[PDB]
Subunit: 485 residues, 4 copies
């Protein structure tokens, strides 16, 4: 299957001539031949975006909204194609790629809905005869760099909202999910957006991504990926004084208190910690349980983990877990497991690997020095930690460099609110999963989980700037030269 | 006179023992002996602010207001001391420092007024039985790094607004204006803020400023200075994934169309372009004139420059201009004049310098390769360009790396608005000077002039983060394990 | 044509019918209900019962129904146009614009439903959480006029539904088939029973029941100011709130530094579109002495180009008839009054059937009826003034205060004049009846209270609810013996 | 001691020449001669206000803020004066009036704080080359009409906030608390406001108030009072199409679930339901408790009600309750106890009354047909209703014509929110008193409890209107005449 870049309105081959084969994580089957673009495909894309910017930003918002609704109609027609690819290229189960596609629809609609309603401000002026307002203005051409785990929805949240509010987009997907990127481009072009407004360039982050980050005609970069990558991207962005949105790692706590429906808490816990093989930035990566319910909770959780069906996600719709994205991740997960075992940890079930599939590894009796407590474990290896009181629940919760999401299960209004207040995270949920997400809410972290927020108006904040503009209606006397009446 | 750091409730001498001497830009006379602090002194300041943070952030906003209102009382009583020191250390005329002092009063008050009123949002949930809201949380320890040209007001806008909304502060004033910084510390202390909440550290930027910028326990740095400096700071800040506010340089365009009162235009142009010796970020640094009034305008502009009185800013109230801040700035103005003469620009007046003083130098017949058209000219050298039409005015206006402020002079509504939305600046003013500033408007630039906004709630946006928080009120079925209903 | 109650088209309990005839030629169009208080009471009761389920589904689900409704409207475009002309007397271009705008209104309501936000506050109390929600008011009365019965009905209806209220709708008696077509659309869109209700009856009966009923929480009204005062007074009884979009007598002010031809072309469209039957019509034209002669000359030149004919005949017809013969008689009274007081009729004034030519007057004074009253028809005065101050004085010399506009290229004159004119809406270098789907539409003085369009429609039909949570116990000041 | 009107910067006697004597609710001793004004007086004030409007509305907000900040200065100096009038004129205890006075300080500061920050909007335009903004404009002269139970704080929340955003004011206090209003005017005048910006007129509501409500040059009326009076005012206001704010009665429910600390619940309940003798719109007027703790709660509640100390509020700072505002109120309360006894209610305590003092009468075993369940009991009579579950609790809670505030005590987050969402009120409070109030939050009710919101920006919403303004920058073509 032949996949190209999308630049300035047309599908074209990389300037470098170089291609690469994308393989399925399921069985290593060849899916598509895809570009390995170089710095100049990037430059061509960026310049294409820059030229298209003036018209795009200056048409009325309602017109951009129409194009997005057009985008939404095409997408609805392309739903199966997207699912099919998210499953086979990305390793997602039916149910996983169903939710991603449903949410993506809601993401695109949301960007459209909001385009006409992003308001500036009329201000009171401290001077007489002065009108003092604030406009919203497009930043310009915006780079969009994304990960492989939820590559469709994460990309569209960035891309659609960026487009809505008058920016042009240069977009480079994760190299592990380039076909999904190509389907996006397909969708954009069947919607008929003007040449240059949206651009796809497939290639390596350190090369294509970096050129995007360091280019002078790029006003802003929005990025989702690892926290180390984020730090380098911020560093490089400083060169041209462009702004950034960094949606980085997470190691989110799921705290269970003792006044819960223990069974329910275990069902929820299993879902939050292990959906998409724990391949989720807002995954319940670290589980924190109250002593009084720990034993029953651990029995039930393991009971339910054991029931998880692992299989070729192409077989049927009821498969619970697919494989990890690549062989490298399986290796990292067996490291995480080994370190725990070696450190005197107790393995309750799983931890085997066959192919790119990894059987969920659940640990108890850990301390703060385990790799699975100090690093983001982006896969199906989870520590359970037992604590004696709420104050201890919060210390374990916050004992991380990360600060993305988090959650607490309880029926006590005070305990819920106190624990919410004390956990150091960008997002928090009382009595739900850690990876709750709506289209228009402010998604983002603190500490090492990143900087800024995305979703609806918050996405608009990121890709626009405030502009103070005034009009003075009465002439005034000026203080210099003091020799004037 | 002897000046000290203010750290953790207490005035103290540098860990390093080292003391520098601060002399007057007016005559070289010794003003005061000031610290030359080290990286050690910065860390002590930072940790103090960290330990004071929790208690300071968690009281109700109305307490924080009461302390700010308290600062306002104290500041009102010191006014003349701030005035004295701005003139004798910064070189500002009476009128200049009077204005800085009045605005600083409004700044302290604006931040106090708004503390209780910085709101979050209650959201419509896409999910049944879900409460979905967004809180405002303070960032934490905020580093405040300021320049020498308007050291009182630029500092206070940052310190007051940052404090109000629940952050703590480590402040490093410009090395050329350390006494102003110390006088601020006096104020804060006289107002009895809790120890550690506010901290002063007088020292070299590349060692004291850098420690602030790279420290772990600092969440945000708000910077005002050169753009080169900004790029540095933004890059080191990336190390700890902290956020920044960069208020960098400007080369703001003053466009004068042909339907104006030409004499008024001149009077405004002079004040805008040359006030405080043109050492103002939002100075009218590049004056752009319609050909139909160019001869008259230039005649008039030069006429009023001639009238500018340059003297000791301590002599009397009616002194138009004082010295530049040091020898280095004079040298720099000399290069600027050299280059422009070297390139065939017609020098109409000024150029004379003695000690730190400098008579304003006006040029015509320039082109876009002149250093005074490509760089920020942070002093009293000013180019005037004649253009033939509105397009041309705009093309020239946007021909710069900077995008801070800007202004157009006309009585025609279409011409004013079409020029306004065509010039690329963070701010813009119609029929007023380029450096309008009210205490609660979004102040800031685009392109190379920086990132973010400061003033009122915009200051608040910079030093807070949004936190999405939810409560789910009905239990749900989860997709895995699919076997289970 | 029938009512729509609790998900059913049904006959009026009174069994009475009345014939709708066409303003264009007097020919019968449809037999429509002539409902009474009982029919209003049933409708009200349906909406009240449907209320709790409809208010409490997520916004995204109400948005879905509206998008569904939007798709149905698109299918019915040519049906809505044909009625707006045959029933309402609108030209092709007039009804097309009404329909396009209605499309955008329906969409706007859907787009905004999910985005109507409350606030989170700083508490002056420690350990206290303090927030504000948005809640539906409940059952909402929607009472409308005949001049733009589609777009006016839908701005109210669509926006009111989106944000969780139920609706009892009552259209003007001169345009009920349009009201009925609306009921059609909602039914084909599949909204839950009771959520939307149509009752076609007389104002002082059906409308008054709606206004005075206990279970109605809010009434949104568009019509004459006298009715607005009736309605507001009767509404007081049950402490329900109202939105009153009332009459206009909008000034169009023309300064001396304008392109006079352009100014004239604009003037004709603003003052005369839909036979002047626009609340935001340029109803009083105000010109600066320095250009008054050429302006009047050009204005007249373009008015005599206007084509008044059967709006059914083709698409380039400029003007149709007035809605009925009372309106023609009243227009005669305005013209007759103006002539009697010594005013100069520049052009026009012929009538026939319900048709009525533009009548243009100059040399008038403030005592002319066409300067004191709303002239909801094609009779228009031009007033010459010597300077800006006088234009403003003349512009403000009215009980009304809906919209208004000034034509000029001088930024100061434009803005100072804007500050000074007393209206809810104002437009610089554009027509007086400027209208977008999401802007705060409404007036001051005698033109009403409140605002419709977008979030403002939501403001009208929601209330703010302050809710708190205290997380620490405290001591209390009584009994002091503790 | 003699009191005057305040019109156009001048303290003047009424046009009628007629005066009246304000006695104390506490012992009946004479307090002041106060005016009985007439329509001519209201008319003069309305005109003064009108004349004063243009200057006041046009100056920049910061200037209005400075005048307010100086009002704050004055009020701070007059604190003890306001306190002692709030007691001798209105019968508040030391603690009640202290709180009203602290809160009033806050309200005035809050008004000043916000004056410069009330923003309009910049809209996206569906047309090309169009600028589209929304301005905030002040309505004009504003009538302010207020009750007697919290005459300082309620008056001042309206007055200051209305003033802050550029309106002018014609203020008429309750005839039972006219001296408080006079002091307000004393304070305005000492702050040096432009003449006619603030006006005080003391007289009967049906004459002075009705004039304010019906006058063509009055733009808006913000009213606090009985719901019935609200209905009258709203009707009369329709004549000139002026807008109103109606802060009417309440009958708030306090719901106590069975998972609480019962003793604390009782302690809270006594404060919420009986503070200022129950003379609070947001008083906990109908108490609703779960069966599993009802016995224990009722005993405890009665225990602390019995401990209450009723006395001359002037004696000292520890008096829990003073008297009702007048003999009429005692009479009404007696009816309420009378009706409850005849309908089969069980009187657990209280009922003794001498002069204007009244001991809190507490009832159980009541039903929905009792007057004290169907009406606002603006005094110290309170029913306690036992329910079997959270459904019944909501059912009883919403069985009113009212819907001002309301509250629930419970440690269960699910029950707490479900209940709050279900109760029909303009304001709700989880685990605090029904009458929580801050300076800047939207205060107001639904149903019979009124229309609109007061407090900070919400006060500003009520006394301003939005103004859509556009600038079009490209000429365009028009559809008539089509021949072109
Ligand atoms: N906060 C959130 O919302 C969120 C959501 C999902 C996932 N995540 C995070 O995403 C991470 C896993 O994704 P990942 O393996 O794809 O992370 P990654 O290795 O950092 O890659 C992210 C993207 O950055 C590109 N990239 C790499 N180096 C670059 C450079 N020097 N300059 C510019 N771009 C560069 C990559 O392109 P290449 O393919 O060429 O490497 C990729 O498209 C996890 O840490 C997870 O927490 C965060
Ligand atoms: N956007 C605005 O609002 C605004 C307003 C006024 C001025 N400005 C700009 O400010 C500039 C003039 O002031 P300036 O010459 O003082 O600017 P600067 O040379 O860049 O230095 C300003 C501050 O940054 C500190 N600094 C220098 N190097 C640093 C480092 N590596 N790390 C941390 N801090 C460091 C300086 O310390 P030392 O003093 O010890 O070197 C000083 O406190 C001009 O560019 C002017 O346009 C901007």
């Amino acid at each position: 299957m032949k996949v190209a870049n999308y630049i300035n309105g047309e599908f074209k081959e990389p300037s470098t001539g170089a291609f690469q084969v994308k393989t399925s994580p399921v069985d290593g089957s060849k899916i598509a031949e895809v570009p390995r673009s170089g710095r100049e495909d990037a430059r061509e894309a960026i310049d294409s975006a820059f030229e298209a910017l003036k018209a795009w930003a200056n048409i009325p918002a309602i017109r951009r909204a129409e194009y997005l609704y057009k985008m939404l109609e095409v997408f609805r027609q392309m739903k199966e194609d997207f699912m099919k690819i998210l499953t086979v290229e990305g390793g997602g189960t039916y149910r996983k790629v169903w939710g991603e596609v449903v949410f993506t629809e809601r993401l695109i609609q949301n960007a459209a809905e909001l385009a006409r309603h992003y308001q500036g401000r009329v201000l009171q002026s401290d001077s007489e005869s002065t009108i003092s307002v604030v406009f919203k203005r497009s930043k310009g051409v915006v780079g969009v760099i994304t990960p492989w785990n939820y590559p469709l929805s994460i990309s569209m949240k960035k891309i659609a909202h960026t487009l809505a509010v008058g920016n042009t987009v240069v977009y480079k997907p994760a190299s592990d999910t380039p076909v999904t990127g190509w389907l996006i481009a397909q969708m954009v072009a069947k919607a008929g957006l003007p040449k240059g407004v949206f651009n796809l360039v497939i290639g390596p982050g350190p090369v294509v991504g970096e050129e995007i980050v360091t280019h002078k005609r790029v006003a802003h970069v929005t990025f989702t990926g690892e926290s180390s990558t984020g730090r380098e991207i911020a560093a490089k962005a400083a060169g041209t004084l462009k702004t950034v949105t960094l949606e980085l790692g997470g190691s989110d706590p799921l705290i269970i208190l003792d006044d819960v429906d223990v069974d329910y808490a275990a069902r929820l816990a299993v879902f939050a910690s292990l959906f998409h093989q724990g391949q989720i930035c807002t995954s319940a990566k670290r589980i924190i349980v109250h002593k009084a319910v720990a034993d029953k909770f651990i029995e039930r959780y393991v009971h339910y983990v054991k029931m998880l069906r692992i299989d070729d996600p192409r077989k049927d719709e009821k498969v619970d877990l697919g494989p990890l994205i690549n062989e490298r991740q399986v290796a990292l997960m067996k490291e995480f497991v080994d370190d725990a075992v070696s450190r005197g940890g107790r393995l309750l079930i799983g931890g085997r690997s066959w192919g790119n599939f990894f059987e969920p590894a659940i640990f108890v009796d850990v301390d703060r020095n385990f790799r699975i407590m100090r690093e983001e474990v982006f896969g199906p290896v989870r520590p359970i930690v037992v604590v004696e009181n709420d104050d201890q629940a919060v210390e374990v919760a916050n004992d991380t460099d990360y600060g993305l999401s988090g959650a607490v299960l309880t029926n006590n209004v005070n305990r819920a609110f106190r624990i919410a207040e004390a956990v150091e995270s960008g997002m928090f949920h009382i009595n739900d999963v850690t990876f709750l997400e709506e289209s228009h809410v402010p998604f983002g972290g603190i500490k090492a989980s990143g900087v800024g927020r995305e979703g609806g108006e918050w996405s608009f904040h990121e890709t626009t700037y405030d502009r103070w503009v005034t009009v003075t209606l009465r002439t005034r006397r000026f203080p210099i030269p003091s020799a004037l009446k």
